[PDB]
Design a protein around this ligand. Structure first.
Ligand SMILES: NC(=O)c1ccc[n+]([C@@H]2O[C@H](COP(=O)([O-])OP(=O)(O)OC[C@H]3O[C@@H](n4cnc5c(N)ncnc54)[C@H](O)[C@@H]3O)[C@@H](O)[C@H]2O)c1
Ligand SMILES: [K+]
Lengths: 348, 337
């Protein structure tokens, strides 16, 4: 009768989302109050982390200081967590989604549906592959996405922000909006899944360019042009690459312009790009110094874009994306970045 | 045969444009190389400013240290400057364009056209003021750019709004350089209204900074402000309006740079942080004034409730509403209904 929800993931973001979804499932009649959350088990200094969560109602490791609602139940086995869910909320690091889908494949409730909160992009036959497609194809369920200018710490703290839900099915879109929306977490539902999703990968390429601007000492008007041309390349690339409908207007949603802006004024891609431009240190060197060795996604995405556009003969139509690639991997002097924007397709 | 250009105005902005325009007018066969610039005569240490420009080719008061192309001729009488021009570039401060137009009226060439670079509104668009008094087709140039940066050839872009496609390509040819990139669109009114409405959003963004909110909250305020800009334009502008025009420099880019750096944001932040008045911050903004005008026309249309960001700025500036309510006013926004 009422729809059962499983939150597949329990990290910083998954626990922030638990707070909201646990809250709204308990409140709202149409949702089963019992919300399962799959927790990868960890020795929390002796006690099982899933034990600590069900007793203390606090993800002491990944969202310390916050009270997860009591109707949210940690479950160490993902199949047991999801077996009865009508709605699956995928919120794990991209690196673990494959494993989780492998365990879940063939164990879901009939007509179960999913929504991916996983930002970024995967690899596929067409070069880039959307994570929501990896999930939906492996599990055989219809997929929505949730993407926007938001971060777990602020969503847990109830700091005002918005997000975009991409869902092809209007009725399912409205259901997901009811599950996730609060006075400080505002949702717009749009029908273009792929377009909402591809923004999250492309925005980080634009952020590398924005960081180059900061590191080369350009002003805000130059930077605003880099961001805007970057947005226009996002639109043009989605229109040529995405299946499903692509509208310019979708880029004016939170997943598009707002996430772009926040990523270009703060975030690891911008920060490392600026340091690269200022200091001549390699992306690799800065990754070790600043991100404990984490791979920065902006440069890696630019490399994938380069291969896609080379096979289509369109490298010259995306000068900002391709300047990020050439600066990061082919030793193009970062100081020439702006020159690559002086004959842009948008101004032809 | 070749088109004659007059730059009506000679401040920082008009001098910066004269650098660009004089160069392109000399190089391109389709333009007459003799570019007039109307220069309000001033005495600079005993010599006339116009004489200094015509011998040293430097506006020593408003753009010192920059050479103007020698084919730009400073002319002190605005009628003499404009009377043979086919293209007039209006680049004076808002407060004078009314008087300048009253002197020019009737004295222009028959087929003459205009482009207004005067950002901000009169609510009535300044290019409408000009085009209706002078009787000439009007275009606009608006984007994320400032005069000092254009003078220094720092990369930036701009939008030209021009209804006639042939006139638009000529204006683009007159103005475009490697560091001043132009997109021509045909929605004149949409381009121009952005310049006024962006300052309302900027005040809101400054409130957001002053209240201690982060970049994800500021990005929502900017984005909701952009949606209200689009909605208002479709409801106000007698000319056509598409959301796609707001992806141009005049829309999203100018909005971003104003909301991250500009007078409206700076004051609004300090006011929300310290509760320092406004004026004492001022001394120590067109955004609020525009908000007031928005309130008035939204009443007439019956749509005050559909623009809570615009109205929260007005109410917080003019009706005592506590700045601290600004974010609350966005928690049931039409975009999320
Ligand atoms: N953190 C944010 O602010 C934020 C905001 C928007 C979107 N997102 C997206 O949400 C996704 C997840 O981010 P996060 O903040 O929850 O990261 P996290 O590192 O905080 O999450 C840790 C979780 O990863 C899983 N995990 C850890 N080790 C594992 C292992 N050996 N095997 C299997 N699973 C393991 C567990 O579920 C663990 O709870 C990402 O795709 C990110 O893009 C995050
Ligand atoms: K010429």
């Amino acid at each position: 009768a009422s729809k059962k929800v499983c939150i597949v993931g329990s990290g910083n973001w998954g626990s922030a989302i638990a707070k909201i979804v646990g809250g709204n499932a308990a409140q709202l009649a149409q949702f089963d109050p019992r919300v399962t959350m799959w927790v990868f088990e960890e020795d929390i200094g002796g006690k099982k982390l899933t034990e600590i969560i069900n007793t203390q109602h606090e993800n002491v490791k990944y969202l310390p200081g916050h009270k997860l609602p009591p109707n949210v139940v940690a479950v160490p086995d993902v199949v047991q967590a999801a077996e009865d869910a009508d709605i699956l909320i995928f919120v794990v690091p991209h690196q673990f989604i494959g494993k989780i889908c492998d365990q879940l494949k063939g164990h879901l409730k009939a007509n179960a549906t999913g929504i991916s909160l996983i930002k970024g992009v995967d690899e596929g036959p067409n070069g880039l592959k959307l994570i929501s497609e990896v999930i939906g194809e492996r599990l055989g369920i219809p997929m929505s996405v949730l993407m926007g200018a938001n971060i777990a710490s602020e969503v847990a703290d109830e700091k005002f922000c918005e997000t975009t839900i991409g869902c092809k099915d209007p009725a399912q879109g409205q259901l997901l909006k009811e599950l996730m929306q609060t006075p400080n977490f505002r949702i717009t539902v749009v029908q273009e899944v792929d377009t909402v999703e591809i923004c999250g990968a492309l925005k980080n390429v634009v952020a590398v360019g924005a960081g180059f601007c900061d590191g080369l000492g350009f002003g805000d008007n130059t930077k605003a042009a880099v961001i805007r041309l970057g947005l226009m390349e996002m639109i043009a690339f989605a229109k040529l690459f995405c299946s499903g409908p692509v509208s310019s207007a979708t880029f004016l949603e939170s997943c598009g312009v707002a996430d772009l802006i926040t990523t270009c004024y703060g975030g690891a891609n911008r920060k490392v790009a600026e340091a690269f431009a200022r200091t001549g240190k390699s992306i690799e060197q800065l990754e070790k110094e600043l991100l404990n060795g984490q791979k920065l996604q902006g440069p890696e995405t630019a490399r994938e874009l380069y291969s896609i556009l080379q096979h289509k003969g369109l490298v010259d139509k995306f000068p900002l994306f391709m300047a990020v690639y050439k600066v990061c991997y082919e030793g193009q002097p970062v100081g020439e970045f702006i020159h690559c924007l002086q004959n842009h397709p948008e101004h032809m």
